[PDB]
Amino acid sequence: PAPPSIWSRIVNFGSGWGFWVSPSLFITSTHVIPQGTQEFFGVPTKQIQIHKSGEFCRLRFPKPIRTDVTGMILEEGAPEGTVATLLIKRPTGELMPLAARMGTHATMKIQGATVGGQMGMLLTLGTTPGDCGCPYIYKRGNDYVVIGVHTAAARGGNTVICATQ
Numbered sequence: 503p504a505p506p507s508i509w510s511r512i513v514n515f516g517s518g519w520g521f522w523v524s525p526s527l528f529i530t531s532t533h534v535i536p537q538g539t540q541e542f543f544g545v546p547t548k549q550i551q552i553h554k555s556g557e558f559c560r561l562r563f564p565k566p567i568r569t570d571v572t573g574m575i576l577e578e579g580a581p582e583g584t585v586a587t588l589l590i591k592r593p594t595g596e597l598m599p600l601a602a603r604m605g606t607h608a609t610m611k612i613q614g615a616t617v618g619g620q621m622g623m624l625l626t627l628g629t630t631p632g633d634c635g636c637p638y639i640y641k642r643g644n645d646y647v648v649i650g651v652h653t654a655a656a657r658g659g660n661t662v663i664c665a666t667q
């Protein structure tokens with residue numbers, strides 16, 4: 503499960519979703535970002551500072567946009583064995599948190615491409631196309647930590663991939 507504040511940060515972004523780590527820090531997947539728009543949330547792309555590390559896409563805006571959200575902790579993956587939660591929203595509005603025991607951090611070969619991220623293993627419906635960009639989060643003490651965004655889900659198994667950095 504997750505609090506309603508963490509869920510509010512997830513917003514539709516092109517083919518998938520994106521997560522407001524802070525009023526001005528927006529993370530998403532490289533596969534889902536729209537490649538034809540010169541504006542994001544009314545802010546010109548010329549003012550936005552984008553840094554991409556594989557399928558992890560980082561958007562820094564000049565001004566704060568979502569002043570309602572507190573700034574969370576963003577880190578490169580979670581300790582091996584950490585049971586994280588994949589907060590995937592669906593178009594219908596249904597909320598579908600999935601429990602995923604994170605695993606090895608590594609550079610992977612996904613469909614002939616190279617992706618830095620962390621493997622995960624879903625526990626006990628599943629992920630689908632249009633889910634990339636949704637965040638992985640786990641609770642550390644009393645603080646919430648986001649570790650990456652969804653990127654792929656190997657077929658013939660419950661292996662999921664959490665792009666990082």
Ligand SMILES: CCOC(=O)CC[C@H](C[C@@H]1CCNC1=O)NC(=O)[C@@H](CC(=O)[C@@H](NC(=O)c1cc(C)on1)C(C)C)Cc1ccc(F)cc1
Binds near residue numbers: 533612615632652
């Ligand atoms: C093209 C449409 O694009 C989208 O809509 C993005 C959403 C889907 C969501 C998947 C979709 C289903 N369940 C899910 O969670 N993502 C992808 O399709 C990715 C490919 C896979 O998931 C493949 N996985 C692996 O190759 C793979 C290999 C290992 C190892 O782990 N995963 C296939 C499962 C489709 C796209 C991709 C390609 C090359 C990369 F560098 C990085 C990413």
